[PDB]
Amino acid sequence: IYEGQTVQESELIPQEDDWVIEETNFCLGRNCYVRFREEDDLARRALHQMDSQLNKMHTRLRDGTVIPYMSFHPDEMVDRPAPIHTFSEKPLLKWTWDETYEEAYDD
Amino acid sequence: YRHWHRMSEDDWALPLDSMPEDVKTLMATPQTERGFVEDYWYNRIRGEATLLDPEALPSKSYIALARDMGLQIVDEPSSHMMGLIELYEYLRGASFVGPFGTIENPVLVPAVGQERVVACTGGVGDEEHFTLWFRCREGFMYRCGECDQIFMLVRLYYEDRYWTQTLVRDTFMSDGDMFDLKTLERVHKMWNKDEMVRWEVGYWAQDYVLGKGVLPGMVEEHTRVN
Amino acid sequence: NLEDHFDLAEYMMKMHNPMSEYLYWIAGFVSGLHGILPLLHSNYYFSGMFLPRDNDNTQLCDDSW
Amino acid sequence: FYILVNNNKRIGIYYIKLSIIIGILGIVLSYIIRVELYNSGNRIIKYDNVNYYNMVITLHGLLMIFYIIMPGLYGGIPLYILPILSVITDIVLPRINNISIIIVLISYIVVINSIVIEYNIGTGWTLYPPLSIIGTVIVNMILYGLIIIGISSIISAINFMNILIVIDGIIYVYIWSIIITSVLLIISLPILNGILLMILSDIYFNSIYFILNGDVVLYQHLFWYFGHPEVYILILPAFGIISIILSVLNNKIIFGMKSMILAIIMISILGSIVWAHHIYTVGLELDTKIYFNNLTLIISIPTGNKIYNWIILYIGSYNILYNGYQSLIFSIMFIIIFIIGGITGIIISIDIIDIGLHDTYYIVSHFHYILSIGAVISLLAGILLLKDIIGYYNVIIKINKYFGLLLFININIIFTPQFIIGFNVMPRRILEYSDNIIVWNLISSIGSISTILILLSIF
Amino acid sequence: AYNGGYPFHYVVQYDDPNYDCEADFEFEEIPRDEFGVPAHIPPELSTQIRHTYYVPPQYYPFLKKLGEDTPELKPYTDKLIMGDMTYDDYEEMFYKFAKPLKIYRSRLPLPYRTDEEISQEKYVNWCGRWYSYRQRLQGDYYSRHYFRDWLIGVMLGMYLGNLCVQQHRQYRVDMKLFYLEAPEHKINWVKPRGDL
Amino acid sequence: KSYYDDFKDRLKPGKYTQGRCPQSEGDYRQESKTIGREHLNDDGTRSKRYTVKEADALGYHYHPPIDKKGQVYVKGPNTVIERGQTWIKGYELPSMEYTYGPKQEDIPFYPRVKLNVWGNYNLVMKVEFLFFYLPTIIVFGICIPVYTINFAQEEVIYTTMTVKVTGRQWYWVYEVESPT
Amino acid sequence: TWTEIWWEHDPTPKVAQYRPYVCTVESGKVYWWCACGESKTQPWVDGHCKCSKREGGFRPRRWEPEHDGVRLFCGCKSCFSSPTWNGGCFTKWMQSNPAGGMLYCFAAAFGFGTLTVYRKF
Ligand SMILES: CCCCCCCCCCCCCCCCCC(=O)OC[C@H](COP(=O)([O-])OCC(O)COP(=O)([O-])OC[C@@H](COC(=O)CCCCCCCCCCCCCCCCC)OC(=O)CCCCCCCCCCCCCCCCC)OC(=O)CCCCCCCCCCCCCCCCC
Ligand code: HEA
Ligand code: HEA
Ligand SMILES: [O-][O-]
Ligand SMILES: [Cu+2]
Numbered sequence A: 001i002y003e004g005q006t007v008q009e010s011e012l013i014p015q016e017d018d019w020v021i022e023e024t025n026f027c028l029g030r031n032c033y034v035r036f037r038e039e040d041d042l043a044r045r046a047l048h049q050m051d052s053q054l055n056k057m058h059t060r061l062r063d064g065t066v067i068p069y070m071s072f073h074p075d076e077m078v079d080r081p082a083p084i085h086t087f088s089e090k091p092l093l094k095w096t097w098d099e100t101y102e103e104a105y106d107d
Numbered sequence B: 001y002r003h004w005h006r007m008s009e010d011d012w013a014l015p016l017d018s019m020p021e022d023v024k025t026l027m028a029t030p031q032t033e034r035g036f037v038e039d040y041w042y043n044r045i046r047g048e049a050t051l052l053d054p055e056a057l058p059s060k061s062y063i064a065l066a067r068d069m070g071l072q073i074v075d076e077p078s079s080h081m082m083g084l085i086e087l088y089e090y091l092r093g094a095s096f097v098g099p100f101g102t103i104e105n106p107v108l109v110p111a112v113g114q115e116r117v118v119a120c121t122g123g124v125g126d127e128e129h130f131t132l133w134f135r136c137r138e139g140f141m142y143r144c145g146e147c148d149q150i151f152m153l154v155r156l157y158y159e160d161r162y163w164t165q166t167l168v169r170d171t172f173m174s175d176g177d178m179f180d181l182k183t184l185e186r187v188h189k190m191w192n193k194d195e196m197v198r199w200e201v202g203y204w205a206q207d208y209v210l211g212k213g214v215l216p217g218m219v220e221e222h223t224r225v226n
Numbered sequence C: 001n002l003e004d005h006f007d008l009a010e011y012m013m014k015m016h017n018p019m020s021e022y023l024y025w026i027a028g029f030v031s032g033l034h035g036i037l038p039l040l041h042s043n044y045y046f047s048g049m050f051l052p053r054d055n056d057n058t059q060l061c062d063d064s065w
Numbered sequence D: 001f002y003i004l005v006n007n008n009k010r011i012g013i014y015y016i017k018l019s020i021i022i023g024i025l026g027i028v029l030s031y032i033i034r035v036e037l038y039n040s041g042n043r044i045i046k047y048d049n050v051n052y053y054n055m056v057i058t059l060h061g062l063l064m065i066f067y068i069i070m071p072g073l074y075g076g077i078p079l080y081i082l083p084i085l086s087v088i089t090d091i092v093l094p095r096i097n098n099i100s101i102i103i104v105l106i107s108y109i110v111v112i113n114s115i116v117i118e119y120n121i122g123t124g125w126t127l128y129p130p131l132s133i134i135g136t137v138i139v140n141m142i143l144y145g146l147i148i149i150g151i152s153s154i155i156s157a158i159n160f161m162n163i164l165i166v167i168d169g170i171i172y173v174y175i176w177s178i179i180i181t182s183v184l185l186i187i188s189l190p191i192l193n194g195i196l197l198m199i200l201s202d203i204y205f206n207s208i209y210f211i212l213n214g215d216v217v218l219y220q221h222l223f224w225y226f227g228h229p230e231v232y233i234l235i236l237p238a239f240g241i242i243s244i245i246l247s248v249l250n251n252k253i254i255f256g257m258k259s260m261i262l263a264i265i266m267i268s269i270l271g272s273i274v275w276a277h278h279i280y281t282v283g284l285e286l287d288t289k290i291y292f293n294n295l296t297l298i299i300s301i302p303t304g305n306k307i308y309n310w311i312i313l314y315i316g317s318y319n320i321l322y323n324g325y326q327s328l329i330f331s332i333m334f335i336i337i338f339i340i341g342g343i344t345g346i347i348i349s350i351d352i353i354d355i356g357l358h359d360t361y362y363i364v365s366h367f368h369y370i371l372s373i374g375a376v377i378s379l380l381a382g383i384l385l386l387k388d389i390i391g392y393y394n395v396i397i398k399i400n401k402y403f404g405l406l407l408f409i410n411i412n413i414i415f416t417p418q419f420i421i422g423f424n425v426m427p428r429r430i431l432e433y434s435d436n437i438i439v440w441n442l443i444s445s446i447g448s449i450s451t452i453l454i455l456l457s458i459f
Numbered sequence E: 001a002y003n004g005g006y007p008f009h010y011v012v013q014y015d016d017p018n019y020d021c022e023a024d025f026e027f028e029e030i031p032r033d034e035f036g037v038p039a040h041i042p043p044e045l046s047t048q049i050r051h052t053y054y055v056p057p058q059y060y061p062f063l064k065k066l067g068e069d070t071p072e073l074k075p076y077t078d079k080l081i082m083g084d085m086t087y088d089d090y091e092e093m094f095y096k097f098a099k100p101l102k103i104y105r106s107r108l109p110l111p112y113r114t115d116e117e118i119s120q121e122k123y124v125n126w127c128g129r130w131y132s133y134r135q136r137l138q139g140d141y142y143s144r145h146y147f148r149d150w151l152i153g154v155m156l157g158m159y160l161g162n163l164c165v166q167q168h169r170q171y172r173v174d175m176k177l178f179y180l181e182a183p184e185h186k187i188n189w190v191k192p193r194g195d196l
Numbered sequence F: 001k002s003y004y005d006d007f008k009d010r011l012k013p014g015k016y017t018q019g020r021c022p023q024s025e026g027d028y029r030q031e032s033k034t035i036g037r038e039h040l041n042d043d044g045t046r047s048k049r050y051t052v053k054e055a056d057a058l059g060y061h062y063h064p065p066i067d068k069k070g071q072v073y074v075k076g077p078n079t080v081i082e083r084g085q086t087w088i089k090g091y092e093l094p095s096m097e098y099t100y101g102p103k104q105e106d107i108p109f110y111p112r113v114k115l116n117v118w119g120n121y122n123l124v125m126k127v128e129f130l131f132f133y134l135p136t137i138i139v140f141g142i143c144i145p146v147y148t149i150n151f152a153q154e155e156v157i158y159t160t161m162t163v164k165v166t167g168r169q170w171y172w173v174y175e176v177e178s179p180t
Numbered sequence G: 001t002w003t004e005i006w007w008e009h010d011p012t013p014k015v016a017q018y019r020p021y022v023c024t025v026e027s028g029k030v031y032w033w034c035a036c037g038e039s040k041t042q043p044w045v046d047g048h049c050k051c052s053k054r055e056g057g058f059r060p061r062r063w064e065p066e067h068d069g070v071r072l073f074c075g076c077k078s079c080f081s082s083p084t085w086n087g088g089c090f091t092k093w094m095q096s097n098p099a100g101g102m103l104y105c106f107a108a109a110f111g112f113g114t115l116t117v118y119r120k121f
């Protein structure tokens, strides 16, 4: 069963005595129905919808990396509402292993 | 690749009836201005002209020999692009498995657009977790919320175009000395004489330079019924 | 085109003509009528009344109405 | 275009749209039934038009099973998300997907047209001979609808099976749920077609299978050999939805994924070999009865494992997240409701208990709690979860605690009393009844009118 | 080892220069293979015959230059000069000198991160480890709490079930006394009604 | 505070029922004459000519997008060279107030937390065993009762009288031996 | 007991009261709940407790009612549904006085047993 990543005590040792757990808000913000402008036409309302996607949002950490909107299933990865053609570039499921080959390295 | 179907006949060679009939202009066109068919026959005519001249091959440098056959001398810029192209193509019908990504060496996610859907499965063994799908947009160093695996998007983009073998060849290959039609004629007479044609491409090519129908048997070769 | 990105773009962008919704509701309403109208027709055909009066197939008191 | 579209997501919307439309006719028939059963006497159907009631109950059952819940849970949600869950561009067979929905609509039009034009008589949704074969042409029309529906179901099953060849990711539990239902259809439908053809032969080709020296019990074997696999073809997609909703909304990875998957496979195999629990009162041999009773009780084991795995999904979830969303409430309500339906199923599984409870309203309440409550709520919960992806609006459902509460209370007012009258006893498929059963019938009728009123508040 | 040994694409030769396998319907012309073997000589026999490539001797100096510049290539070029290179030898030469394309990570543009942010990498990793430590411990804590609670449900369901056991127990006692003592039980009481 | 008042100005109440004037006052069914809008109706919806009557998928207005070199226009990233390194600045989505309306302030705090997982493998395995075998025990507890009651119905009894019952539409016929 | 015996890196509150605080709340207003149990304006942060000063990992807990009414609020500072009350105040009390906990539980169970048995019997 999965019980999280394994931690060695050495990795829990801080580099400063004042280090605490970063208090970054992971609430993306306040939202509601997407509100279109009357002036916008069909094309410009499409752009508006594409700019309100929660799955394109993320939270930036103190070191500049961002934790993205994540989901257990790929159903939450398409634009909402679903466009006619979704996964043009095949979504990549990344598997990890310990195998390596020499060609990838240089001395 | 495993996802590709069976080689066509064209994948090996093109029919001589697809040779452009204006050979004189074909051999003078810059590479950036040659289409796929024009580029095929420019390389074949020029490449076979040098290969069918044995007495000159030993004195020809590999740089010049590669140019005549239309082969691109490799360099780090072009190797990088070609490699990432072939990696993109392989991932079209193959699994995505590799070393765990870190800040020093993020998981490289090739894409043509500005976004590609990616899933993190964690590490190996007990460090593997359930698929966590996220949208990998360019310009952000992504960190999995569960295993802290670092991801990064690599875009195959160059000057309002994506990366292709044709784009790599056009950007980095440099046209050499203009092809001389005298070489075509000289090699033509070498292997084609007295009704024996041992360079069919050079017999057709010389005929077109002559104006189409000039060489023996070529009017009969060009006369079709349907 | 941007207009073609989303399936049923007019509806999703909230520009569709309301008549489409009306037709959908009308179609459902007609479907419902297929259970009521033949009931009335069959009742009249075999009895002469479109609908019965509660307990009119049983003995009723003199003052029943 | 509208009818020419091959987009798998558009077709999924069509399936839901058509299920709601046809569903209006289904609910109307249900209201007729409950109105009639409000007291003893004739209320809305004349005593000379009792054949109409027999037709109402027959069409109610057939439409809700084959034209509403099956097109909604096996055609609607599946065609919209399955190709996305499989990280594939579109469905494997685009043109087949288009014709399947068109076929469903055409078979629906045939059925309703037969109401209007043919004489109205009924033989139950189980079309038992010899009654089914001595009827009028309306029975012939209904047979054509079922056969046509069967074509759509099988081709759709073929479509989903092909996802195994193209799936580019992991087969999630929901994908496993649809694949197994597809397998159940591929194995059960061909048997149904055969027995339906024999019904036609006796109706239209002067065959004699269902007259003396021919065993009428033969039909019941072949029919129910498809019948019970059908009830799991209708519930398994609902189970798949429940798994996704609980994991997503609680932000918890599915626990015992492989046991969930292997529980679905197990239910299918067992569901393919227990059909004769519908034939307990015919007079089968003692050993046959004991076999079927034994295997029927076994189905609870895999079904029980799934229920408990769902419970732990909801346990321990963060309190800060708002739990009043309609999708979450419906998913939780499914566990509470399905246990009631399943337990009563185990009660009726004991054949000696079944002698008393066969062809009584206890059976009705049993399969209503699972389908009319559980399956409906599961389809609603699934659509509600995909509201943003689907993009529909102009309804007040997403956050409506009044609707959920009123629905739960009133739906139980309808069917809980039907368990009581099962032991009184009130037979099924009847309209008139003794005066001492009015109280419970009246209470259930009050429940039916109330539920309908609550369906208007969503708009 | 694919397609039964039949090559998907292969060369065929015809002796008559004006022969067309689609227009003509004669029955005397025998097609040849790429090496020139007539079709009436079976494959099992022709494949045993050794065929080698013969280049014009004017190419020998070029093939010699190739061997010297690349000593690993010399043995193959020598075979070609001496007319000892079969098709298999050519294939071995071809695949021996094929190399994979190289990708350089140093050429990849990086997502923008300020120097302040780059100095906090160790801190963020430190936070991630503590989050994984707290996650793993909580799993044990929660598993113990909730699975223990489920026992309360067992006991509550055993109490409520026992209530119906007691009712059933009293019911059976009452039933045993009906036919024995209950005045409600009457015999020689019901008389046939008769046909109306 | 009331967040609706922040974006009240953007929401001007409407004048027409369903947002369209009577077709007589303005014909929204016709195609727009504005240059560059030939594929749209006057009200902005896509014209039937563009989508149905002359749909490009049916062979109308054939225009291959890809060029001779097998290329299509692609927009590049926002590149910013700095500190001896080429950087790409990602595109950040606009503030949710612009797209949704509410002002992004006083947001409740939801901290980062890794997935809530069940621990103690040994304990979990035992529970899963119970999730399967507690029902199995109950079934086994019913099995013996089921056999007995089935055997009871099918018991060879020394019956001394026979009543034959035939069911017809719609009445029950009864045949009984008559006293001699 | 998570803070007491399992995990020593989360802030541990002080019990202000082993009983919930009853307060009237209004929709559209935001309330701040004391998570340390040292505020003198219970159940709210007073501006002088640990939560107000952001000391030792203590922060005010934001809360907002959907509708107006009277709501119960946690005094033990450990209820699972904090700031709202769900009975954790009694549970935490039993941990601190296990003998008292048994007395109440026996009494509650005794009443439940009598009523359910009296009605069914
Ligand atoms: C169970 C119920 C409760 C459920 C509660 C819970 C629900 C939860 C949420 C569920 C959500 C599911 C997913 C939703 C996805 C929606 C996607 C969507 O919007 O797609 C876009 C799609 C189309 O939008 P579009 O892209 O703009 O399309 C443009 C067109 O393609 C092109 O535009 P156009 O204008 O050119 O269009 C052509 C148009 C042209 O139209 C016109 O010209 C119309 C002219 C006016 C006609 C008006 C009707 C006249 C009727 C006269 C009757 C006379 C009777 C006389 C009787 C006399 C008696 C004496 O139409 C036609 O030509 C063909 C129309 C065919 C359909 C209508 C058929 C009607 C019935 C006919 C019966 C015939 C029976 C014959 C029997 C014969 C026997 C012999 O939307 C719709 O189609 C509308 C959908 C609206 C509802 C969406 C769901 C909302 C949420 C649910 C609400 C509750 C619903 C409950 C069920 C209904 C109850 C009644
Ligand atoms: C989707 C709908 C659905 C579902 C899931 C089921 C599920 C079950 N049904 Fe079915 N049933 C119908 C729909 C359904 N049924 C219909 C529509 C009819 C009537 C058709 C007609 O006659 O016209 C019918 C009729 C029917 C009868 C006929 C009674 C009669 O004709 O007199 C019987 C009896 O064997 C039966 C049994 C069962 C059993 C044993 C299950 C099992 O699947 C239940 C399993 C679930 C549980 C057991 C609860 C969850 C598990 C646990 C909580 C574990 C612990 C429990 C135990 C250890 C027991 N059903
Ligand atoms: C899944 C199928 C289904 C559904 C939903 C229902 C729903 C209901 N049924 Fe059901 N019923 C059957 C299948 C179903 N029934 C079958 C198979 C029989 C036996 C047939 C026979 O005897 O031959 C039967 C028999 C039956 C009878 C027995 C009549 C008789 O034979 O004597 C009665 C009345 O007592 C009844 C009443 C109801 C009521 C009051 C509702 C509901 O109205 C209760 C209220 C619930 C709702 C109104 C919501 C329903 C909404 C939808 C279904 C649409 C969902 C669509 C989406 C979510 C997109 N039903
Ligand atoms: O049918 O169970
Ligand atoms: Cu069954």
Ligand SMILES: [K+]
Residues within 6 Å of the ligand: D036, D037, D038, D039, D040, D041, D042, D043, D431, D432, D433
């Ligand atoms: K009645």
Ligand SMILES: [Zn+2]
Residues within 6 Å of the ligand: B120, B121, B122, B129, B132, B144, B145, B146, B147, B148, B149
């Ligand atoms: Zn990860």
Ligand SMILES: [Zn+2]
Residues within 6 Å of the ligand: G033, G034, G035, G036, G037, G038, G039, G045, G049, G050, G051, G052, G058
């Ligand atoms: Zn405080």
Ligand SMILES: [Zn+2]
Residues within 6 Å of the ligand: G073, G074, G075, G076, G077, G078, G079, G085, G087, G088, G089
């Ligand atoms: Zn508390």
